[PDB]
């Protein structure tokens, strides 16, 4: 037969929203967090994540912080509080 | 599959199908012994 060679290897990432559903189905909460953290647009954590794995969170991701500003621009105040389970001490997580 | 069209017959279907029965038919007054509540409304 006559067989051609194609161009794909000559001419020539993002995790979608569905992969989140699959990860939640497995219940891999730490893996799911890892996708939306320093292995993403997260400057503070990614700055030292190289060096922790070279030698051997607690902050909202930049995406959430960016989301707050957009809602903050629409005269909407999005506040994240952590009411303590020990002494009921309410503290506002800065975003 | 399909409950009876007649509401009275539908009540019969619930009791045999354990959907609802008289044992589940109670209010706050009788379970808490509010005997005085009887003579305060239907007057």
């Amino acid at each position: 037969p006559y067989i051609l060679k194609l161009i794909h290897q000559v001419d020539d990432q993002r995790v979608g929203e569905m992969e989140v559903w699959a990860l939640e189905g497995f219940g891999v909460a730490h893996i799911l967090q890892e996708m939306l953290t320093y292995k993403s647009d997260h400057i503070r954590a990614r700055q030292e994540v190289l060096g922790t794995t070279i030698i051997g969170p607690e902050d909202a991701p930049e995406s959430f912080r960016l989301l707050v500003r957009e809602l903050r621009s629409l005269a909407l105040e999005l506040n994240h509080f952590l009411v303590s389970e020990k002494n009921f001490q309410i503290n506002r997580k800065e975003v | 599959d399909w409950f009876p069209e007649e509401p009275f017959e539908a009540f019969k279907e619930m009791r045999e199908r354990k959907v609802f029965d008289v044992s589940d038919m109670y209010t706050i007054a009788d379970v808490w012994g509010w005997t005085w509540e009887k003579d305060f409304k239907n007057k």
Binding site: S63, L76, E85 | -
Partner: protein, 612 residues
């Protein structure tokens, strides 16, 4: 059992003008400017001013710190005015048409404030300007004294709404709405569908109104905040050089309104309103542009993307940015069939593996003193020393990776495999798992992610591996069932002897093997074919699955031995003894298939020798 309590409240609400100022604390913006055309510098007090939004080049604060705009006249928030049903209309009980004309059709409203004394017979919204209100009343009370109580009697624009909202007695609103709602249901049916249609709308309006009022007094949200006097500004990083021209549009429109008020005795009315309705429109299109009756368009007739749009659609920063990320440690390349791979393994190319395990390889070089520091290791990796590949080979050993199909299909669209360094520049994949991924081999590219944290590596190995996910949760059926030529090969094996007229030319009117090993060995020596019938001396119990039928023929010898010929096996019993000899009529293919399963079980048991 005490649950590990974790209470995390995430409240949202309207923001007071003071808290808007608190965000900018001073962040006042007055110049509708940006980076200079020539000097490439941010103008002072501009949309990119360094003083307002922090240093340009720490510099990370520009993503967070934001400024505000001081509007001379209040502006209604279009989310609560033109998004039907209007919360302002519900709260003020006035129909939306009256509110629209009060802020867009230069109408006037009577008695905006009730908490202060008033001396006028005027009642409500006046679509016509009062003749005596412009030259007679101001002259009588003098201009200086007239403006003191001017807004107390007649107010125009969003200022009328804001003062009216402030003046609202929320307790009273609940009381009179309830009795009005009670009164409407007292009459009952009216006999007319149209009248009954409207009585339902009014009753639901009253219920919605009092529900809105009951929420206001139980929270710290003031209804005046629906009409903002300060406009927050997005941080410059989030708006690099579309919405910038909107911000410069409201700023310069508002600034020129100041020039129409700060000047000595400007012309009121036709000029004051002109750049007071426009400033309302500028804030309107800035917040929400799709709800406008005449949405604003650019010179190229492009519909402006409002802040509502930047959080509504998929391109908005709500779904795409949050539900999914441009995850690092990702490598996309063509995949090929690794038929020799194990079910839980995947082959990674050297150039893809080194990219994913960049940090871990550097750690190995530093740990074993091959590289003094990070800089030496990175240069050494680029040098591609033979030691680097040896370090990479041991680094990937025991470190699972996640393989993801970008057009994801199932829960198996993302799964974890143990990577092994393989030759070539393509990702070898197990044939069975390529069905869980629907990985056709006419072209496919997978995204691979390497877990970093020890917790992530733990759950990747212990929850997502293919050896623990064999049943589909839909019904509980296996997913890694052999298919394609795997199923063909097994079918040929178990497709046994030709039977009946397909085996003998004429009506009749075979080797015996003491054990399965001889039958397999004879097949290897080409002595018998795969489908050629044979008799296997069966040492176990009766185990073959055949249709339950009486023997075809029983050869009962006179000495007590009787042979029972079944459809698929021969059983030799005796009366004197209890020998119970069984011979199975089968093929090498059935023996090979049975032996393969039995050997797999024994091989797995011996490897996992818990006995020792």
């Amino acid at each position: 059992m005490i649950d590990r309590y974790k209470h995390q409240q995430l409240r949202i609400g309207l923001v007071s003008p003071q808290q808007i100022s608190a965000w900018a604390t001073v962040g006042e913006v007055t110049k509708p400017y940006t980076f200079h055309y020539k000097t490439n510098k941010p103008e002072k007090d501009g949309l990119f001013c360094e003083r307002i939004f922090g240093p340009i080049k720490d510099s990370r604060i520009r993503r967070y710190q934001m400024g505000y705009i001081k509007l001379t006249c209040p502006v209604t928030h279009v989310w609560y005015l033109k998004r039907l049903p209007s919360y302002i209309a519900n709260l003020l009980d006035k129909p939306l048409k009256e509110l629209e004309g009060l802020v867009y059709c230069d109408f006037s409203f009577a008695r905006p404030i009730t908490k202060k004394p008033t001396f006028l017979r005027l009642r409500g919204s006046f679509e016509y300007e009062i003749q005596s209100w412009k030259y007679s009343i101001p002259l009588f009370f003098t201009t200086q004294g007239f403006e003191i109580f001017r807004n107390r009697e007649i107010s125009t624009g969003a200022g009328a709404i804001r003062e009216q909202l402030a003046d609202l007695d929320l307790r009273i609103i609940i009381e009179n709405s309830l009795v009005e709602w009670k009164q409407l249901g007292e009459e009952g049916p009216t006999g007319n569908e149209w009248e009954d249609r409207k009585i339902v709308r009014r009753k639901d309006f009253l219920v919605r109104r009092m529900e809105l009022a009951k929420h206001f007094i139980r929270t710290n949200i003031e209804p005046e905040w629906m009409v903002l006097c300060l406009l927050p500004v997005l941080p410059p990083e989030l708006r690099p050089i579309d919405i910038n021209e909107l911000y410069r549009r409201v700023i310069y429109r508002n600034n020129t309104l100041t020039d129409l008020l700060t000047t000595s005795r400007s012309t009121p009315g036709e000029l004051v309103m002109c750049q007071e309705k426009l400033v309302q429109e500028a804030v309107d299109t800035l917040l929400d542009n799709g709800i406008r009756g005449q949405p604003m368009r650019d010179g190229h007739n492009k519909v402006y993307k409002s802040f509502s749009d930047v959080i509504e659609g998929k391109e908005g920063r709500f779904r795409e940015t949050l539900l999914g990320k441009r995850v690092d440690y990702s490598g996309r390349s063509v995949i090929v069939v690794g038929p020799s791979l194990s079910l839980h393994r995947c082959g990674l190319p050297r150039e893809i593996a080194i990219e994913l395990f960049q940090t871990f390889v550097i750690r190995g070089l530093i740990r074993q003193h091959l590289a003094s520091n990070i800089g030496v290791a990175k240069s050494q990796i680029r040098e591609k020393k033979p030691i680097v590949w040896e370090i990479l080979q041991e680094v990937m050993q025991g470190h699972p990776v996640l393989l993801n199909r970008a057009p994801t299909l199932h829960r198996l669209g993302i799964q974890s495999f143990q990577p092994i360094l393989v030759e070539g520049r393509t990702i070898c994949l197990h044939p069975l798992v390529c069905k869980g991924f629907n990985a056709d081999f006419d072209g496919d590219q997978m995204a691979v992610h390497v877990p970093l944290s020890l917790e992530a590596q733990a759950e990747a190995r212990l929850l997502m591996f293919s050896h623990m996910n064999l049943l589909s949760p839909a019904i509980g059926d296996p997913i890694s069932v052999p298919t394609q030529d795997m199923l063909i090969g097994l079918y040929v094996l178990t497709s046994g002897t030709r039977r009946g007229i397909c085996a003998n030319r004429y009506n009749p009117c075979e080797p015996f093997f003491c054990n399965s090993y001889d039958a397999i060995g004879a097949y290897r020596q080409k002595r018998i074919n795969l489908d050629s019938p044979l008799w296997l001396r069966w040492q176990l119990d009766q185990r073959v699955i055949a249709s339950k039928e009486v023997p075809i023929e029983v050869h009962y010898e006179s000495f007590g031995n009787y042979h029972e010929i079944y459809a698929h096996y021969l059983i030799v019993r005796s009366v004197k003894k209890e020998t119970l000899y069984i011979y199975i009529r089968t093929t090498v293919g059935h023996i090979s298939f049975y032996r393969e399963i039995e050997e797999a079980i024994q091989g797995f048991s011996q490897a996992c020798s818990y006995d020792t």
